[model samples]
Structure formats: structure tokens, C-alpha cells
Target: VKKAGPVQVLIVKDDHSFELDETALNRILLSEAVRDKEVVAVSVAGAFRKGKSFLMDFMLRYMYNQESVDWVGDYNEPLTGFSWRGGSERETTGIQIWSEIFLINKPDGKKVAVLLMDTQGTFDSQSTLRDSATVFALSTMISSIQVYNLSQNVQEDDLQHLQLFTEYGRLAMEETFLKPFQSLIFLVRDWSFPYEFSYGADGGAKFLEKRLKVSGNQHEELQNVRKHIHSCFTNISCFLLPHPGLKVATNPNFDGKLKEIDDEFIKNLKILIPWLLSPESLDIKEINGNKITCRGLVEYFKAYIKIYQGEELPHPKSMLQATAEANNLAAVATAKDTYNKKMEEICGGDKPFLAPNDLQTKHLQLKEESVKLFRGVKKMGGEEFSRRYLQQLESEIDELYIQYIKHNDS
Candidate 1:
């Protein structure tokens, strides 16, 4: 069936209420396949009625055939992966993730789990800008590679939309001075000017640079828009794809067959898909210079979705603050647990009373160990929050030490 590859994780109703499916999310992220492994997620997001899902299906095919001599699938088999169809109506209402996780080796020889994300189309009549931004923002935040699917050409309006999404990221991380997002690809579909920009990624790079170029004659506001995008994303480029023929687009019954797709589209795809998934191109998701493990990524998702669950989108600072708080809370809990476990071993219910000097000495040693653990595990936001939470961890440990002493005295 065409319905099996992706599971919906975030649901946005027609009236614009947002709901996150933690159960589905945990099932994927918490799986043994990615446990303790670094992860790289590739996500596609764009306007409604475009072929975002269709493109994702092809990506699925390539991943399915990763090890074989022929990585692409059979042309005769209809493309079925992310619930795509030929229609004007918006089909995907929320974010959907692939049911499968692909394990691939990066350049460092460390294997990372690769996840696919398919998001709801943006700017449909039924959904407001806030709804569109929410979906776009989440996909961008979660994915190491975010494919911004655009139609026809990389126009000014498209760049403006990108600015709106990335502006908040810049504001959120200004204190730390780190790029908020990773690789971004502006995938231009149905491109007409092969002569000017050519085709494939090489041409698309030139096209993207030309579009983003700021001339002295340009207005200050437009110049800043380009500069802001440059600052927000670590790596950004474009890919030009030819149209997939008329029958594939217009015919109601047209299933996604490789044979029906234009030769140019297929030819470019062979270049694009492999390039996108190459070891050199893949980047492990990182926050505040710390590589994100599968478990850490799950924590980030929970922190980020809390902001989107509200009636309105949160401020950039609020989003940053929430994730920082969540990370520090986890760190504090772990540090306290570590200290308590070691202390319990020495002065727990059945243990004989120890000397006052010995108890104090053990407490101080464990306290230092817990502080080191907290610093190693917790890296997000700015220095200010980390210091505050370290203080909290210390106070909690001291209180527990006092209780342990009372038991020792008794």
C-alpha cells in the first residue's frame, strides 16, 4: 500500500490547532536502531499542491536500494512512499516521518541514523501563515538537511519567506553566536532556463548565489534579508529539477511511475539524490557544538513542540529559553541521581553509622563528580542559564547531603 512509509507526528487541524503525537515520535526516535547513535534527518517542505511528497517518494526508493548496484528502483512500479497524489487539494495536514531508519557512515567513519521527514504543504487556503510557519519552522529545526521546495524559479518572494522563518533563529542564537540551522537546499522545480543557470546542483549553486547577491543599488532592507539568511544557516545551496511531464501532473489517475517522468528529471535525480545522501554532505545534528544523540534529539523535539502547541507562535527568546530549561532540568536530575546513588551506597538504611569527617569527605567528592557530569551533559543556550542550573544542582546536592548526615547521626 502507498500509505505505509510515513507516520504522522504533528497534527494541525483545519481550524489551526496543533497537536504533537508523542507516542509516534517516541516509537521512531526511541527505537534501538538509533539508540545512542547520532542522527541526521532530511526533510522536505514547501507550498501546497507542489510535488514535495512525490520527490520524497523517489528519495525513499534510493534509500531502499542503497547497497545494490542499481540504487534506483524499477521504473514500472508506481512510486508510493509519502501519500502523494495528483490534485489541487492539500493532502498532508501535518508532519510525517518515515517508518524506517537508514544507518549510514559519515566521513568520520561513525555511523549515524538517517531519518526522513515529510511536512504538510505551506500557504494553502485552509491554513494561515502562522500554521504554515509552524510546520516550516519545526521541519527546519529538526532536520539536518531541509529541502525548501520552490516552483518555477528562486524568486524574491521565496527569499522573503525564508527570511521570516530564519529571522527568529538568528535572534534566538545571537547570544551564543552559532548558526541556528544546518544545510538548506532551495529545490527549484520546473525550471525553464537551462541555458542560463543550466541544470543539476552545480548550476543551481550559481543560480542561488545570483539570487542571493546583494548589489549596492539595492535597498537596505532587502540587503539585510540576504545577510540574515547567510548568518542563520551554516550551509545553503539550490538544486534545479525539470518537470516530471504533463500526465504526471494533470491526469487524475496518473500513478508515480519512473517511465512517465521526463528523462531530464530522472537524469538530474541520479545526480541529486546521491549527492544529497553522500558521506561528505551528511551532517550530524548539533546544538551548541554538541553532537545530538538520538535521545538528546528526542528531548529537543519535546521542548520545541511545546511552543507550537499554543494559540500563537512563541517569541524567539521564549523558544530558546524553553529548550535551555528542559536541557538543564535533565542535567540537574541526572547529577542529583548520581550523587544520591553513591551516597546511598555509603549511608543508606542498612549501612552502619560512619564518622562525621568520613561522611563530609565522601559528600564533597561526590559533589565534585556530579558537577563535572552536569557540565559535560548540558550544553545549550548561553552561559547564563548553564550557571544558574549548576547552582541549582549544587544546592539540591547539599540539601540531600544534610539529610544523609541526619540519618548518619541517628
Candidate 2:
């Protein structure tokens, strides 16, 4: 390889020989390198047990068509070139730091450089080593993509703990670290739950609301957190992954389930390249070499959070409630129409003249009544009560249908 200014360049000769001449290849390599492949550096950051290693393994398998290097025995040997010392037991102090780089050679002649960094997950404890490593990783890399792992089944207590560490990490990255990165991808694991159970459904929303309300006075702090996370990436993306729990091995039809998992993974991967390679995102006139002085580049990302923040936050449950009510109303209208038609056939069509109502008007009245009853249920209780009431209504409709059919059939 030849060195031209700060870039290393290589040349291929006609005889199938290769030569390194920085001066000769600098311009060509810089211009054509992307045509053949692009380099992507992704940092995996989060609390431990959030499946950081497992995620890395999954990505490696996808990119390289090979299994992850096992860390338990001979294959577990650390790559010396990427090893550094940092992190504590309480946090990530005095721990061995390592990373793996994979080159994905696509069939289209396009290449992708994937750098996966696994850090010690001890940020909550304030371990000196862990904090230091985190800061160093954020500050040193000029461009990066962060993968933040969040459990879909996150408990209230766990969320509280995460909030603290996430706040600190965000602040450190923005104010102290000052790394200008390209993108962020949030991975939400364990999305599947039984019908009766839910994350936000199970008091998570109330817990978050209470915390945010209490911290309303800390508006500046909250703004800083948002800013820091925004600064780390030129673009932001999110994906929800089903937890590869016991089903991975236990399901008799594992092949079908595995295909579903793979489909979700590929969908998430597609978002990264388009966002990163977009003309707007890569339209930088210059690249900064230093960390602290990279603030000027923040101008490129000023509009980033503005476009994404609204879509990322939670919504009011009132909208969902309204939808459920509307559906119940429609169902009731259909049932009432069926009942009326059967009654008319039994008593003879002439009997219905007493009411002097059109068929559409009668259906509308039935729908309105159902809506009123649903609203009453809502007033008395929340989603759980509404669900129970709907089930009861369904059963009542079934019984009425039987009676109408039996009386008219004879």
C-alpha cells in the first residue's frame, strides 16, 4: 500500500500484480472505493443482558455467512489488535475491550465494512473504567452508527435504572465526547406477549408519565439528553425483534419461525444503507479529524431530530379506545339488522309498518345505542373492562341470533 497524504492507496497491475502508490491511487480510490464497497462502523452499546453479544452474533452470521467466534475456548481468544484495557467490576473498569470487523462482499460487487464494538455494560454503576471506555469510544470515532438494545419486556424498575444511565451516556457523548456519527438503530427485543399482557398496558406508561411530570422542571436537562442522542447520528432508525426465547429450540416448526426472524433482520438492515448513503447525508464538504472541535458539523444534523421526534414518542390511549368503540358499534348494527329481518319474516312484513322506520334508520339507531353502551363501559372502567363488556355483548348477540332463527323457521 502507498501513502498519499493521510490515505493509503493500492494499485492492481495488468499482470495480476498489485502495487501501492499513494500518489497514483489516492483520487481513484477515494472516488471508486464506494462503487465497490462502503465502510460502516456500528457501535453496540447498552446495559449487559440486553443481548449485545447475541445481536453481534446474529449480524456476523448474516454478513459473513459464518457463525460467531466462540469466546469460551480456543475460538474465544481475544484479537490482540483491537484489545484495550478499561472498565471496573462495578461498572466496566479494568476490563478487556475488544471489537470485530467483518467485510461483507455482496454479489453486486458492493462491499460493506461492518465494525462491531462490544463494551462492558456497567454504565449505571459509575465504574471508572466503564465510564472511561464509554467516553473514549464515543470520542475517538469520527463516524459511527450506534445500536441501542432495549428489552420490550423492560420492567418499571429496570426502565428507571436505564433512564439514569441513558441520560448520563447521552450527556457525555454530546458535551464531553463530541463524536459526529452517521446513524443510530434501536433494537427492541421480546416483542411477543400474550393477549392480556403488554408493556405500556402494564403500567409502563403511567410510570414514565409520573417520572416525566416530576422532572418537568428539568426541561433543560431533558433537552440536553435529546440533543446528545441526536448529535451522535445523522439519521435515526428503529426496529422491534421478537425475543429468541425458548421458542428457538422448542418449537416443532422452528424453520418457519426462523424465517420470520430473518425477514425482520433483513428489513432493519436495509434501512441503514439507504439512510447513510443518501446524497443529503453524505454531502459533507470536509471531514474533521479531531473530536472536541467537531461541533461545527452539528449543523448537518440540526434537522435530524425535528423530523423524527414526534414519530418516536408515545400516543394517548383515547384514540385506541375510540377505535374499539366504533368496531363494537358496527358489529351491533349488523346483528340488529339480522334480528329484524328474521322477526319480519316470522310476523309477516306487514307487521313492521307500526314502527314506520326505514331499514337504514333502524340500523343507525342500533349502532348509536351500541356506541352509548360502549361509552358507558369506558366511563366505568378502562381497556380491561371494555374488553370484558365486548365479550359479553358478543355472547348476547349469539343467543339472540339463535332465538330469532328458531322462532321464524317454524
Candidate 3:
């Protein structure tokens, strides 16, 4: 498979002008790679120059070579994917997306289009807090699994930083069945105390459990940060990757040759990559309670971008409102189609005319079916919005049924 490489979908200019590259975004999201397929976006976002892109390459490599017995590839082979390099002065700016889509089968045997996202580092020296927060907010909102790449260990600042997005997700969640965000992987790089808690996924899980626990008499706000994070995402976990060798971390000349990496680092990399691509770990994109197709995700991107206009970030609830509107509209349209198509089958030009009583009976039956279809459709927002839309749908169908009776009599 030829690599299409990563395309910049959002850019933070030198003057700090944030621009969402709609043209570039449309180019990838609208491509045939994801056409009519369910989308699962796996994005990496955290502090700047923390090898987020570097990690992404490993994911891409493993995904592309999953069929092979040795998916990790040769030791001497340098990891050459994404734009990662040594002594980075922030290599990735704004939001970058891999254009090539990997179609993977979920546990249910349904295939989903998987897209990888690399976001600009948050809290970097150059970007304003507003800009950094906005970037992470959008990335988390769009991604099915957001890999929060952390250096050293998970710190209080890290949680505070993440709270910015999680808080939004929490406020936006108007439905109980679906959380605003999905899986979160806190990938801690260069673990210093393997002795204290061992290493790898098991160690990280233990560490995360302790890290998230709210013990002692802490300030309510501080405790709430932890509380909101837990409540916001559907799944939250951690993974640890030990220090990759001095050459890989410090050497300016070091290309990502697997041989130069420590043996332990490689071993963990093997485990981490496979685990992420596993069916159980892969999460398909969903909004409210409805599953989203690739085309549907593209629509979400467009709707989300509107709320981010101007230098200031929009309210989290506003973002959720926009998402709800898009989702609810689609549901209404689908229900309408269901009603119209069935009515058309019986009442079309080719069909024989029915008496008024017969037509009323048919209309009542079809109306019941259409209302049932609307309720079954996973609508966004609260019950009020769904109720309003259902009412509108009923009235529109009633008008159409009256016109059908007129045509039948003629």
C-alpha cells in the first residue's frame, strides 16, 4: 500500500493566526478511502516535541504490516513515517492527518475506515493557551481514541491540561447512554521508576488507578478535575514506554533505526502497537447514540469548525449543540425517507386507487411505522429536541397523506 503521507488540516501561522484548512480537510475526509465506511480516528496529542509523531509512525507501520508474521519489521530498518526527527523545534504545527485510510474489521465483523491524526503540541512556548486548548479540544472531539503522549510521568499539570478538553466533553454530554468522548490512552514515555511500579501496560494500569483516585481532603475544584475526567470519557487507561536509548533521544544524527533502540523499548513497542490495533481496543466513531459513517464524520468536522471561528474558543456546550443539530437533522431526514418510500410504493402513479377508508387505514399503518422508525433512530441532544423533531415529522407526513388522498380520488 502506497503511503499518502500526512496532510495538514489546521495550521497555526507564525503570527499565531489559527486557520482550519478546509480544502485540505475535505481532500482527505471526502476521499474514496473512507467513502461510505464507518470511521475510527486514532489521534495523538500532548506536549510539544515529545515524540508523538514518532509513536504514530510505529502505529502506522504495525497497522500496514498486520498480515505478516513479523509486523514490527526488520531491526536495521529505520522507522520512516510521519515527519519525525531529532532536536525537534515543533515539527508538527496545528493538526496533521494521515490521508491513507486503513480499513479494519471490528469485533462484530463490520469494517471501519481508520484514520490517524497528529495534533500540535499543547502548552508549547510559541502557542497561546487559547490556541493549544482549541487544538486539543477539536482533536479529542473528533477522535475515537486520543493517545495523550506524555513525557517522563503523568503529572498534576498533565491532568490540569487534559481537564480543558474533558470538561468540555462533560458539559456537552446531554445524553446518558453515550459519553461525549471515547477511549483515552495516557502513553507515558521514559518511565523513570519501573522499580516502584514495574513497566509496560500492567504497571501503567496500576499507576493510572492510583493516579485517578481522589483521596484525602483536597479542594473541591481539584477533586472535580479528576471526577470530570472519569465521567467524560467512556474508557480511560495508560501505557508506559521506557526511555528509547541515548542515541535515539539525544543524538541529532540518529534516524529511527530499530537497532539503535533499546531491546526493552522494542519489546514494549511490539506489545503496545498490537494491543491498540486489536478489535477490542478499536472504537468506532459515534455521536450522541448514533454510529457515524465516514461521510457523516466529514459533516461533523464541518459543523465543529464553525464554532471555532475567531481568536476566542467557543463554549463547550455550543460545540455540543452544533454536533447535536447535525446528528438530529440527519435522523429526521432518515425517518422522513422511511415514511415517504413506503407510502410511495403503495400510492405511486402505477398503483391502483384506494377508497377513502382504505387510504386512511394505510396512512394510519404507515404513520405508526414511521414514528417507530424515528424513535428507533439514535437522536442527539435531550428528549425535548427529539420530541420536537418527531412532532414536525408527524405533521409533514400528515400533510403528504392528505395530498395522497386527493390524488387517489382523482
The most accurate candidate by TM-score is 3
Evaluated at residue 385, the lDDT of candidate 1 is 66
How many angstroms is residue 202 displaced in model 3 relative to the true structure, after the best TM-score fit? 1.0
User: Which parts of model 2 are misplaced by more than 4 Å?
Assistant: 1-38, 66-100, 104-112, 123-143, 153-179, 193-224, 247-410
| TM-score between candidate 2 and the true structure | 0.36
- Candidate 1: worst-modelled 10 consecutive residues by lDDT: 310-319
lDDT of 3 by residue, 60-85 (tens): 77777766645677887886644433
**Candidate 2 residue-wise lDDT, 1-410, digit = tens:** 53211111222233322233433222332334232334444455566556554455444434433333322112223222111212231323211112233445545554454334453344332233233333333322323555556676434333333334344334333344433455555555565642423222233333333433443343234543334444644655555454554644244323332333434343443343333333233322123333221132222222222222223222112334656666655555555555555545544534444332453354355445654554543233456745665665556655654454344344
Task: Name the best candidate (by lDDT).
Answer: 1
Cα miss at 127, model 3 (Å)? 6.6
In terms of lDDT, which candidate is stronger, 1 or 2?
A: 1
Q: Between prediction 1 and prediction 2, which has the larger TM-score?
A: 1
Rank the candidate models, highest lDDT first. Answer: 1, 3, 2
